[PDB]
Design a protein around this ligand. Sequence first.
Ligand SMILES: NS(=O)(=O)c1ccc(CCN(Cc2cccc(NCC(=O)O)c2)S(=O)(=O)c2ccccc2)cc1
Ligand SMILES: NS(=O)(=O)c1ccc(CCN(Cc2cccc(NCC(=O)O)c2)S(=O)(=O)c2ccccc2)cc1
Ligand SMILES: [Zn+2]
Length: 257
Amino acid sequence: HWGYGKHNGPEHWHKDFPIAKGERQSPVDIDTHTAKYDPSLKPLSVSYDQATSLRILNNGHAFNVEFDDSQDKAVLKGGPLDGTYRLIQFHFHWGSLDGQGSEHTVDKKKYAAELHLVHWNTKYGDFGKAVQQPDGLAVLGIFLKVGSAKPGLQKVVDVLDSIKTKGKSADFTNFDPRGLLPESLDYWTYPGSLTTPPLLECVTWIVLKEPISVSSEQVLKFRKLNFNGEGEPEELMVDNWRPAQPLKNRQIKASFK
Ligand SMILES: NS(=O)(=O)c1ccc(CCN(Cc2cccc(NCC(=O)O)c2)S(=O)(=O)c2ccccc2)cc1
Ligand SMILES: NS(=O)(=O)c1ccc(CCN(Cc2cccc(NCC(=O)O)c2)S(=O)(=O)c2ccccc2)cc1
Ligand SMILES: [Zn+2]
């Protein structure tokens, strides 16, 4: 099975998932001097006041915080998007060291981690149908740097001991994802893909310019998670990021001057 080791990492994925070498793969490097301001982009609407978190799961690659997406409770609209995109889950990608971990890069800069808030287009009815469409998903990406603690992340950090290994889950109700956002919603956007197998080319990427700050203690607790299952030799869950892919025939647009 695929992963992030020497033997099953990103450079191997194309053998089982040939779209790995496709025309709209993610992540990418964001060249800030080449991205063009697009005055036609609408303001982005993040409407998370009625968000209903349910559970947190260690899936052997990352951890997902899952939401009730059976109604329009936590939605993303506007920006580059046509229609309404429901929040289904968030997760992170992070490094073994503070100088790596993000998937997207900014002028080749790597951040310590990257948060992905995953949303699906309601016109396709369910997530599994949406990932088969070029406009099926919208992923809101937010960079993490190490500095001051993020208060809104601590509830996540403190439950990680209870889901140390692959397959473990825990109740995770009443978590407000607004506490993970930066002040500004300025963004870059481009058409891309899932960053893990099956690497489907279904994603409108919206990457925020402003990173959030988390503490060294917070990211240290991410790095104590395990890729392995219970009772197996320990392999720390670190470096679960895909490197930048070729941009090919794509333009990155900026929401801001
Ligand atoms: N294209 S991709 O990224 O989806 C992809 C698919 C399959 C593989 C192959 C993974 N193995 C290399 C390996 C690495 C480490 C240990 C072991 N053996 C110990 C064990 O597990 O009993 C084998 S393995 O076939 O030997 C193997 C398969 C399944 C489970 C365990 C092992 C790579 C990459
Ligand atoms: N890094 S990223 O932001 O680009 C990104 C990468 C991967 C994914 C993973 C999406 N899920 C798994 C999955 C992948 C592909 C297709 C399907 N079809 C539905 C199915 O198989 O039941 C599910 S899921 O784990 O969130 C899920 C589980 C159960 C039900 C629905 C969704 C999200 C986002
Ligand atoms: Zn992701």
